[PDB]
């Protein structure tokens with residue numbers, strides 16, 4: 001099964017602020033809906049509270065070690081091992097994030113979905129960095145800059161095929 005990371009970040013790798021994210025970019029959330037639809041999202045508790053509801057069309061799966069955590073509309077996994085058990089029959093998995101969630105699935109990733117916003121915000125969680133020792137660009141693009149969406153980001157994708 002394909003473990004794909006799905007991430008938007010600063011030019012300084014910031015992905016988050018207090019708990020809620022640094023920006024607010026409707027069109028970005030579009031690309032995300034699009035590429036993700038019909039696939040499981042694996043996220044941590046704190047990432048889900050930011051979102052604040054289940055994302056329609058996708059098995060939302062939350063990752064806590066806590067044996068008594070439940071939210072409606074979402075599955076809970078208390079392990080990386082469980083995540084693969086729930087997604088046994090699954091084509092592709094999207095690690096939706098929380099930095100610590102990315103750290104968990106680092107030994108398993110085979111595909112990366114990075115958005116790079118050029119502008120630097122105030123906040124404190126970061127994307128766990130990885131490979132100029134790989135991987136392979138497989139796609140680039142620019143996105144909508146508007147009155148809402150005001151920043152030059154680039155939709156990226158990579159593939160570790162080794």
Ligand SMILES: CN(Cc1cnc2nc(N)nc(N)c2n1)c1ccc(C(=O)N[C@@H](CCC(=O)O)C(=O)O)cc1
Nearest residue numbers: 006007008021029030032033050051055056096097115
């Ligand atoms: C806080 N946040 C986390 C978030 C935001 N942008 C990201 N962008 C990328 N590229 N990757 C992520 N991991 C990511 N995560 C959110 C908040 C709301 C929605 C949301 O309501 N998304 C709708 C999109 C359209 C809508 O807003 O209704 C969806 O169904 O996917 C998504 C992510």
